[PDB]
Structure 1
Amino acid sequence: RSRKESYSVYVYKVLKQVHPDTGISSKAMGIMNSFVNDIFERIAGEASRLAHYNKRSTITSREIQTAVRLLLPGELAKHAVSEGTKAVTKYTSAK
């Protein structure tokens, strides 16, 4: 049984964390699944070109942090950058 990859458990956990006594519907799960895979190939796709343009081939944390300000607008880009910096700091502080 070759099951298909889908983002359901993490989406439900995030929804329960940001809104109690809530949930997802039928088509809403597929909409969110198609939305995640769409931005997954957009942010990661620009990092490869940005690394190739500088004669490099290493996509680290800065390659993803800089790609936030290109795809995301203004306030959302700064918020995502701050969240990513806090996450990488908590990761480097303790393994």
Structure 2
Amino acid sequence: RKRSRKESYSIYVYKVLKQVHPDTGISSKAMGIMNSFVNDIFERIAGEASRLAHYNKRSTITSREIQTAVRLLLPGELAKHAVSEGTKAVTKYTSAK
């Protein structure tokens, strides 16, 4: 009975979907698509942030570097909204430990 454990991001996506459109479901294949999508974006951002760190002789990757990467990759208003969400989130984290 060797029993594996393959991780994924499925359940979180399902939660968000039930939050935004309560009377709606989603097949497994589409969830797999969204999983691959998230993986792709994570890889892009991390790689970019790494290069930013190396060019400035900094050994710490910080929220600032993430912010910079997002401003590079993404266009306009999408970047602004993402940045606003991140700033609100980090501000809430820093206070209410």
What's the TM-score once normalised by structure 1's chain length? 0.95
2:67 and 2:25 map into 1 onto residues whose CA distance is 31
The offset of 1:17, in angstroms, is 1.0
Cα deviation 1:15-46 (Å, max 9, x = unaligned): 11111111221210110111110111001110
Which has the higher mean CA deviation after the structures are superposed, 84-93 or 19-28? 19-28
Task: Say which one has the larger Rg.
Answer: 2
2:87 and 2:12 map into 1 onto residues whose CA distance is 21
Unaligned runs of 5+ in 1: none
What's the TM-score once normalised by structure 2's chain length? 0.93
CA RMSD of aligned residues (A): 0.9
Unaligned runs of 5+ in 2: none
Cα deviation 1:31-75 (Å, max 9, x = unaligned): 011111011100111001000000111111111111111111111
